[PDB]
Symmetry: C3
Subunit: 462 residues, 3 copies
């Protein structure tokens, strides 16, 4: 029986942002959504988020996350950020006065924390019957973290903040994860003896360690070897660091499952993208949102995709694209732009310097050069000539061949098997199997250059 509190009420000063810290993203999810997903998995009885300026967030919690995760998540308010000890107090008010379960406390700013780390904490805390168990790690650069102070016997004495004591002695490398389990009555008790006479002048949660030690209670510290699972984010340097470690691990999972990623350091893959066996991802690539790739694909160099579905055996090279689908064996790129609502059928082709927006394109159809296709629908085994524009719902049949430089002034229907001359402005329906034209005839004006440009190419018309 446990209640979990997420502390998300701080000002996030060092982010230098008008966006609340806990809303800052990595791998496709805000830090708060990473944290709330880990806990939901653990499925505790009670789950509580402590908010300050409550409206720019209260909305995303529950409103997007408790429904999605299919559980209740309570919001508790802390009006002024008096400290992590004061934040816990406010979290406790959402529990009944007679609450008897355990209390787990975590920060909204530790995004790699996972269910398992949380479940072992709870299990250690029960196993040793502790008043407080705290997760610790060891780090080469310990700055900003509260340091674990141990007695002569390796007993946890206290936690000391960066700003406070450990004067010169900050050299300590065993750090506080900011992740705890507590007996409730020992928690209510220690919090009532908190004072704010310290370098930050705040009610620190960390002080509770030394206070329960004084009442000869049991304090257990529990070392997490994989430091990244408990790393904090207080600034944008630490954010990009952890984003990058999370990326390495998501890439590694895909590799081990049968995906060749040529260059992991420049391959960004959101948590949620799926990618099938034997596809190849070339450097300089981001796969974002709910993107899905089948097997045997080539994801070429310099491709950005957000919510794009790509079937088996398709090629997607230097493409910028979102909210679109690309069929089996289709070819896309290089230098191609897909806007939302693009659907390209199996074995379809979108070539170099082509943009498609809100359009349907049938199996084995080809748009290879320098063309814009918007709000149009196109059948199968058709061919759209180079340097053309769908001007905006235009309907094009199957096995159509349109000429280079045709303009389609919406709405127009071009029948199956129809053709269009090069340089045609199409303004009316074209029956099946007709040829549509508008360009006037070629007229050659002899010796024009000798007369009108008497230098350069004037030799050699000579």
């Amino acid at each position: 029986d446990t209640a979990v509190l997420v502390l998300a009420a701080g000002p996030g000063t060092r982010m230098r942002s008008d966006t609340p810290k806990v809303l800052h993203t990595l791998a496709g999810r805000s830090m708060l959504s990473h944290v709330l997903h880990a806990i939901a998995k653990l499925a505790p009885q009670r789950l509580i988020v402590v908010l300050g300026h409550d409206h720019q967030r209260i909305a995303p919690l529950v409103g997007e996350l408790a429904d999605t995760l299919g559980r209740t998540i309570d919001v508790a308010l802390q009006d002024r950020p008096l400290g992590t000890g004061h934040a816990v107090l406010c979290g406790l008010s959402a529990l009944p006065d007679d609450y008897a379960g355990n209390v787990v406390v975590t920060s909204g700013d530790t995004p790699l924390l996972d269910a398992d780390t949380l479940a072992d904490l709870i299990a250690t805390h029960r196993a040793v019957s502790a008043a407080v168990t705290v997760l610790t790690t060891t780090l080469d650069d310990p700055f900003g973290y509260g340091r674990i102070l141990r007695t002569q016997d390796h007993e946890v004495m206290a936690i000391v903040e960066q700003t406070d004591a450990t004067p010169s002695q900050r050299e300590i490398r065993e750090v506080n994860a900011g992740v705890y389990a507590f007996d409730i009555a020992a928690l209510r008790s220690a919090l009532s003896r908190l004072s704010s006479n310290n370098a930050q002048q705040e009610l620190y949660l960390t002080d509770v360690i030394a206070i329960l030690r004084s009442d000869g209670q049991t304090v257990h510290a529990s070392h997490v070897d994989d430091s990244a699972l408990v790393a904090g984010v207080n600034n944008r340097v630490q954010l990009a660091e952890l984003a990058s470690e999370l990326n390495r691990r998501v890439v590694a999972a895909h590799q081990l499952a049968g995906v060749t990623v040529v260059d992991p350091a420049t391959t960004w893959i959101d948590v949620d993208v799926t990618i099938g066996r034997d596809t190849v991802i070339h450097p300089g690539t981001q796969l974002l949102g709910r993107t899905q790739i089948g097997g045997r694909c080539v994801v070429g160099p310099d491709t950005t995709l957000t919510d794009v579905a790509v079937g088996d055996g398709a090629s997607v090279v230097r493409t910028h694209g979102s909210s679109s689908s690309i069929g089996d064996g289709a070819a896309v790129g290089p230098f191609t732009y897909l806007r939302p609502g693009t659907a390209l059928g199996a074995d379809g082709k979108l070539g170099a310097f082509v943009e498609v927006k809100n359009s349907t394109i049938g199996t084995g159809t080809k748009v290879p050069h320098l063309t814009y296709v918007g709000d149009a629908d196109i059948g199968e085994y058709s061919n759209i000539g180079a340097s053309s524009v769908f001007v905006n719902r235009t309907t094009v049949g199957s096995h159509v061949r349109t000429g280079s430089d045709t303009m389609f002034v919406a709405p127009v229907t071009i029948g199956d098997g129809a053709y269009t001359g090069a340089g045609t402005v199409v303004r009316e329906d074209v029956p099946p199997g007709a040829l549509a034209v508008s360009a006037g005839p070629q007229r050659n004006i002899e010796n024009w250059v000798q007369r009108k440009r008497p230098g350069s190419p004037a030799a050699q018309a000579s």
Copy 2:
């Protein structure tokens, strides 16, 4: 007198691939082709590759590599993958029963191994008169490697596999390279006493170390400090790692020879690309295949080239290109696509949003904007107007100036010094020094917008 065996018969389970492991590529060559190139250099008397599912490969060996390397390479078959000890046995059947030379054994999955490492092995093995010499290295992460066990006196006792013994004690960091020299009779002998009662239930080559130790033979282990030269690839994580270390070294060689590479971490250069003094390679660049760059070039950001020859003093910026040539002082990019058979002469120019396919383009000719050129040939000091298309063999002369938006419906010949109006559809030959036109005349319809769009721009026609 030595015979070299390459073991390439395993199932490659952890690659999760329908492509045989040994065919997986890095820096432009399969692991098997890296390995076979190193040995060819050493030039042993006999060279033997052990294959299993023999047809998807037997083809590339000899068929591409023994001819290319100009030596004989024998294939020996091992039908079922009973173990690296069973693989060696099958390799031995390609040697005469009375064979008396030394036997070198290596894996098809150690691609950075070089002639020199191999030559020192053979020399140590002769020098110390050993029954077996084995190459070892030391590693921070030793997982998957067989561990070297040494007596109290640093004598090699045995090799132990990851799956087997070293229970907790796997902490050992001295690893087996999988690269050996053997006396033949001691090799035939130890292999005949191999059993498969082990965690994998296989006939391990590694066991031969302990067996010859038991017959008080000489076992020499030889430490390779540069660990990368003997690193194995069992999965796609290890593949991308080693691909990346090989890349760093190929980049470093080019830098030391007089090439500025702005960002090595994002510059991929195949082994085989040549690059001349004082050129500059900007970030996000891959130079692949048999690509060649002269001196004083700029290789701009985000350029991909496969089998592209670029002369001195040329510029190639954000270009995607293959099987093509670019003359001295030519400018290409940004946002340019070259398809096979593109030849651009000295001081030529292909600009932004231009594609060229199977075309010849003469010295000092310019195609700067938004145009497609396919299966066409073009003389010197000509100028192809923006937003044009060569529709498919078209022939264009020297000092031609064609108008913006001209369509060339193949086959058509445009004489030297000829011009074309803007918006011309060219369907017939254009004599030298003629002007070709087809666009009809401008007609202005006054106050059209007041009448037909009574809002917006209707003020201010006001």
Copy 3:
């Protein structure tokens, strides 16, 4: 009272370059300009640069840097590169014979050295009253550096060059920064006893350490913990290394000030670029020269900008651009090319496959597709149709709407609120609120395909 000498007279052999080593760039400035900027800040009384082949440089010093830094910088000549000790001698000739200040000596090839490191050196040198103080650091890879040799008591004895002594014993990891302070008379004195009997056969500055030790003078060595501030560049491998460390630090400064940089390892930012709070820089991006970004911008993936000003809240995605301005809330990209003299007004739009050169574009104007705009000026809330070309000063009014595939043959004036049909060649002024057209009428030729292509699309016109 100090005089500072920069030694820049060497041949730079290992750069394998026809460009003098000291002119090689990182983060937007030559190594010499990094070095001269650090010293200028310190503001010494005298500042002297030692040059050899004097003309390819003497020009940039003073000529660009002493004016810019608003101080005098003297050039002293050393005709042949006899050594760093001989270089100092030549530097001294630019001081009066009776000069009595201190003498600071540094290399033109240590580009991260900063004013502060220099000011603490001078202060240590005064504080301890030393004859020579030398800056040292400690390094994992010590190759090419002169090693600090200390007595049994940690007293600096001598400096030994890589090429010379420390035979096997080169294992020493405490290195010479090449940055010194000297008493002038002790400097004149030690230099007069220099000989060139050594592995390089040169007059080494380093020998002066041992010589003043012999005259029982005071030799102080001063350890710099941040090794990068005193790292040298003798080859292009070391150059790209230090360029990359300088980049990491410039990125970090921007992050800590309120800029999200998704991927630091692939974000190049010149020293001098300014970037405002809450903007987001996506991977694969270079911001170069005097580029300026406001707040709330998105700098999308694969953007290169050199001297580009971007206001607040603008979007710049996969754009290659230079010497141009982009207004507040404007959208640019993806796949856009800006050439010098491009000015786009607030809330303007340049879309995919658009190039703009030397053009003015007013507030809320839109050029979204496949168009070239050169030497043209365009008012506000206008719309330039897809696949169009400004052919070269063309003037376009406000609230104009031009049709897809319009060619504007410069010089032409299009009045406010005017329209243009699709496929129009505009050769004469268009009054305000007129419609301009030239395309002829659509003609449909029935059953053409059955007759002229009797296969394929011939079914199904069937």
